[PDB]
Amino acid sequence: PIESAEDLAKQTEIAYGTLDSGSTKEFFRRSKIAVYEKMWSYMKSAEPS
Amino acid sequence: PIESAEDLAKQTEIAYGTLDSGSTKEFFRRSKIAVYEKMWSYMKSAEPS
Amino acid sequence: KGYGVATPKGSALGTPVNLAVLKLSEQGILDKLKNKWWYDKGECGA
């Protein structure tokens, strides 16, 4: 089962997201960690939102 | 078997090192990637050398 | 509980140090140091 953020970022069968506006989205936008950068790129480019 | 640098960095049963002076050691010293930072910390703190 | 950086009462460094701690927190540097000194230098791996 998904146990960490890295597990979410590695797979593609499960989608993940946040609020449209809020602190979590800004955290992912400004993050410099590789895993969070991957997650932010995925969430930004995910369609439908 | 070990198929990448991440597989080396994650475990402790297999030791690893570089030449005492050269481009590889300086690459690991100057790296900002998390896995190479882990590798450099291990190699620098490794005893015996 | 929390660990804080302590300063004398009425010192001129209290506000700058508090703001610096907040900046380091929001930039992810505190977590980076935590990972470096707990897990990057750990002897047990993952």
Query: Phi first, then psi: what are they for B40, rounded to 5°?
Result: -70, -40
Solved how?
Answer: cryo-EM
Resolution (A): 2.9
Q: How far is CA B14 from CA B7, B8, B31, C45, in A?
A: 10, 7, 22, 11
Q: Using CA of residue B16, residue B22, residue B26, residue B27, what is the dihedral sign?
A: negative
- Contact check, Cβ <8 Å, B12/C36: no
Interface contact B10, partner A, CB < 8 A: no
The HSE-up count of residue C17 (CA atoms within 13 Å, CB side) is 10
Q: Is some CB atom of chain C closer than 8 A to the CB atom of A31?
A: yes
| Nearest 10 degrees: Cα torsion C39, C41, C45, C46 | 20
Nearest to A44 by CA among A17, A4, A21: A17
Q: Is A18 annotated as a binding residue?
A: no
> DSSP states of A13-48 as a string?
SS-----SSSHHHHHHHH--SHHHHHHHHHHHH-S-
C40 → chain B, closest CA residue: B38
With the CA atoms of C40, B28, B3 and A14 taken in that order, what torsion angle do they form, in degrees rounded to the nearest 10? 60
The phi, psi pair for B20, rounded to 5°, reads: -60, -30
**C-alpha to C-alpha distance for C2 and B49, rounded to whole angstroms:** 38
Q: Chain C residue closest to B47 (CA)? A: C43
